[PDB]
Amino acid sequence: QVVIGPGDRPETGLQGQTTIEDVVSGRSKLPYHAGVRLVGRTDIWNRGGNLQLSWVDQCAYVSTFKQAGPITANSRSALFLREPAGVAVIDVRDPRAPKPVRLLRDRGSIDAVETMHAIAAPGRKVLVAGAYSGGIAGRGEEDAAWLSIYDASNCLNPKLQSEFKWPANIHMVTISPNGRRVYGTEVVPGLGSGKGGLHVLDISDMKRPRYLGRFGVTRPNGLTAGFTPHEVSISHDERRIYAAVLASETGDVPVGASILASDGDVPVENGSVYILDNSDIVDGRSQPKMRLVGEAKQGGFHSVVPASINGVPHLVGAAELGACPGTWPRIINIADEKNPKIVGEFKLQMNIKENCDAIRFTPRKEDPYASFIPIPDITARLGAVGSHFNDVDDARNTRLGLFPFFAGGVRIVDLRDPTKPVEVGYYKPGANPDTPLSGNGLNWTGLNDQVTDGCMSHVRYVPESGHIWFACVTTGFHVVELNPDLRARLGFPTV
Amino acid sequence: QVVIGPGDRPETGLQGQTTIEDVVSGRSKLPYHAGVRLVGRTDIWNRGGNLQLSWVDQCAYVSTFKQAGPITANSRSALFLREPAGVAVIDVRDPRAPKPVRLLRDRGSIDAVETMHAIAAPGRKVLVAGAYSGGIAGRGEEDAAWLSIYDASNCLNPKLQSEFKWPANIHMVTISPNGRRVYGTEVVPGLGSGKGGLHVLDISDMKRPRYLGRFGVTRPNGLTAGFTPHEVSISHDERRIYAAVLASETGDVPVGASILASDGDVPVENGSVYILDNSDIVDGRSQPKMRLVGEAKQGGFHSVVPASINGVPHLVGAAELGACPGTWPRIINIADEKNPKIVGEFKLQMNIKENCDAIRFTPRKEDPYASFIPIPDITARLGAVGSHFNDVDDARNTRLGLFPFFAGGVRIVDLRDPTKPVEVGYYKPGANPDTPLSGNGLNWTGLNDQVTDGCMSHVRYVPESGHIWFACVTTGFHVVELNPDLRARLGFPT
Ligand SMILES: [Mn+2]
Ligand SMILES: [Mn+2]
Ligand SMILES: [Mn+2]
Ligand SMILES: [Mn+2]
């Protein structure tokens, strides 16, 4: 549970709510927080349009996304791709004063969106960023699915090593723990049909990457079918792949409503989590397969990450966004990987339907224009309160969930009881209106940049310092820490 | 066609288009115009949220609408109804410097939206404003459909005479030419079912108004059926009512997509225009009926106004807004009122489907999320280019259509050939971001107040001066005039 101490600037409505009162008074433009303290922040040249966060050592990388739209060709988007667009390199050697140092604006890094990852492996420091909108059928070379691969041995000055062109649109990338492979998801155009897969790129030689192939899911009957994974995480020894899956070509993963719909009938589906045996690739077997070991239905289509809670292996999975009551993370016990089981769920008060109905300025029932001219309630013109990524503090020794909830800001969750996750803290960064990459009312995500902000990035926990790193669309890159009281309570070590 | 000459600041893209290049460069925040010049303007305490324009003599009345939403109870919306919300009284005695003088904030005027009209009749000047959102079933008395009635004998200081409670939601009001009756449309909750009607209120004593009843449409078969008129206009002798009609209970009238749908294929349908014989009410017959004289299919559901073009009686009707390719006015010949005939259409290039397609950043066929996660093209994030009201310069001697096109600004159209209306001028006011009534990204109309403005009001032409009055959502009240060149070519007096 969350205790309010003198340090805090707590939420003024329901848990996770941005109240219309605060929007009108201007209060919503300033931060809210409990259980945490801001260490440092940079608005990254006041740019806006921030999305993904990756890191190598003491350097953060923050991608950008264009208002022109998720799938719009980069060649048609020059008005939205000039500086300060691109992946910003941020010096965090002093976390009280993070400092943006340069912009990567190569084919993959100019509009990386969700398609960026970095890894510090033994003797290999790598940053990759890809053209999230690239490779859509019928376009030319300029608009292909480019992947820019950087040697980040000097993390403050990543050196472009090569640019590889995928044979399909790649949505998210995950570099293997040894830094020598990149796993790229294909969700488009298959989407709900499940006709996509997981691409593998060998980047042992960063200057000369070698395409491995497009993988489907292989079942015990020996047959392979497509799937459309959104993102994968990878086990420590690379022998397990944990896929968050939107759909299967076998058709047994139900697909639901648009996560950007404002209201309000059909629901968003959670999608499934697949655990995949990746031993074939690890051991260099010919005709390699990715074999289905187990499946957690409703496990979460958007992101899944590994966790170890009191010595017991778990996964944390979630869908994303969604109109009220939105979407939220689920805790999945994988002690038996052949039979994963959802053991707990973490939800805010704003993820309860009854609550969402109670705050509306007008009840759906009273709306004569309902089918005729659908108009969202004013409470739905702020931004979704639902997951967008769902990380943990330490995969190998997990206590805390670090859960971005988009307009709900970043939620800090005690996971020590996996059947009963509870909030212990949160940070909402306020607002930063009129930025170059998020201004002009041209946004497409439903985030209202005039009055609030949205946290959409992966979240880092640094055990040495206790610092938590995250990026928010308009306010930029933040470093926060737990307050002394909460830290003492969690019995985290102390330095 | 628009002669672009000195003093003009032309549109840069297709006719009616707000170009993404201009949004990004900031050019969209400044006015565009051809054929006209600005005489004067007031931003009305820089308030935003303006909608309807009415007038008496040298005073303008401008309504507001709240961000809380079209049908949200006023009692639940106090955060959106603080000053400067309300009907603003504007002194236009000096058109070069119109001045906001007063704010009317009674039950009907606090949030009037489209529901406001004023008339200057012999021995009577009257302004009425009604709670557009009032009278939804299951609410308290404070949230009823109130109509505030003002004696505007002194147009700068309208005096509240009474507040009348309609027995249903009333959407638009039209005062009769003699100033003695108010015609109020009921479109909610019936909407597409056609189950509504036309309410009539006697206001000959403004302090003691008397309800005359709710009327349907009576046909030759002797039956009366409901209809949902959005707005009516009335003939000079009140014996004819021209109704813009969304739907009929007889179901003959095509009802289509949402006017506010972002990016949809399915077009907004035009609805129908009904000509109604109103002689029963005029002559004071008991159990009065409104009898269908004629019907113009596709005539326009939103607004219809009379026009006289080279001595021949016409109507100009239109639907409203809508995604590309939007909605646009139609010219209707009613020389035979029993058989109204659409004879012309005024369309902008932005009302052509193939142009709408050509400006998209991404073609529909290239979007794999098209059904799965529908997302409007960036070109659809500015505001509809489609009619919102569709007036003429002088109903009795018509030369020009004065056509608000929302994000398209106000279009000035040569109607002298009713089969071939042609544009001769326009004014787009630019942008006025961060107003208290239109700011904070809380709009529901689809208007992007950060980079453009929306023209939604009725439009006044003053024959004596040549001045044209209109209101825009964020930029406020404007007075413009035709160029000397335009006036001469069109054959206007001097
Ligand atoms: Mn994605
Ligand atoms: Mn996402
Ligand atoms: Mn209306
Ligand atoms: Mn309207």
Can you tell me about this structure?
Chain A: Mn(2+) 1 binds at residues 114, 171, 230. Chain A: One of its GO terms (molecular function) is hydrolase activity. Chain A: Mn(2+) 2 binds at residues 114, 302, 320, 388. The structure is a homodimer. Chain A is mainly beta. Chain A has one domain (1-495). Helices cover 4% and strands 35% of the residues of chain A. Chain A is built from four helices and 31 strands. Chain A has helices at residues 20-25, 279-282, 353-358, 484-489, and strands at 32-34, 36-42, 50-56, 59-64, 87-91, 99-104, 116-121, 124-130, 146-151, 159-165, 173-175, 181-186, 197-202, 210-215, 217-218, 224-225, 227-234, 240-248, 272-277, 291-296, 303-309, 312-318, 330-333, 341-345, 391-392, 400-404, 410-414, 422-428, 460-462, 467-472, 476-482. Chain A has a five-stranded antiparallel sheet, with no helix packed on it. Chain A has a four-stranded antiparallel sheet with strand order 2-31-30-29. In chain A, a hairpin with a 2-residue loop joins strand 7 and strand 8. The first copy, chain A, is globular, with a radius of gyration of 21 Å. In chain A, 57% of the residues are buried. The complex binds manganese (II) ion (MN) (4 copies). The site of one manganese (II) ion has 3 residues of chain A, from loops.
How many beta-strand elements of chain A?
31
The biggest sheet of chain A, with number of strands, parallel, antiparallel or mixed sense and barrel status, is: 5 strands, antiparallel
Q: What count of structural domains of chain A?
A: 1
The hetero compounds bound to this protein are:
manganese (II) ion
Gyration radius of chain A (Cα, Å) is 21 Å
| Principal-axis shape of chain A | globular
